[PDB]
Design a protein around this ligand. Structure first.
Ligand SMILES: [Zn+2]
Ligand SMILES: [Zn+2]
Ligand SMILES: [Zn+2]
Length: 113
């Protein structure tokens, strides 16, 4: 539960930052989040080049995106991560369909394998 609450707080910070138009915003979590998001906009390394700042922000956005129900969400990376998660769900569904279609005798064999 501890890490879940930590993630929850950080998601709250990201959600606020994403919709905050006050350059004079006094919330330190907002100021910090805006700097991190600005970094990700220009970074050439990104996650595959090993950038810890990008990896941390995208991981946070992914935890947000998993539960996000907003079609025009302003959170950085949210829409794009939801697209990736939808594709993964489709692939999982296609796999499951093929497995169910393989039939009773197959499933029974596997169950007792
Ligand atoms: Zn703010
Ligand atoms: Zn980066
Ligand atoms: Zn979102």
């Amino acid at each position: 539960d501890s890490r879940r609450l930590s993630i929850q707080r950080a998601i709250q910070s990201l959600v606020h930052a994403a919709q905050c138009r006050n350059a004079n915003c006094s919330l330190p979590s907002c100021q910090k989040m805006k700097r991190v998001v600005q970094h990700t906009k220009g970074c050439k390394r990104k996650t595959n080049g090993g950038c810890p700042i990008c990896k941390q922000l995208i991981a946070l956005a992914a935890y947000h995106a998993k539960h996000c129900q907003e079609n025009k969400c302003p959170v950085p990376f949210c829409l794009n991560i939801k697209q990736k998660l939808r594709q993964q769900q489709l692939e999982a569904s296609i796999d499951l369909s093929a497995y169910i279609e393989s039939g009773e005798e197959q499933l029974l064999s596997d169950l007792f394998a």
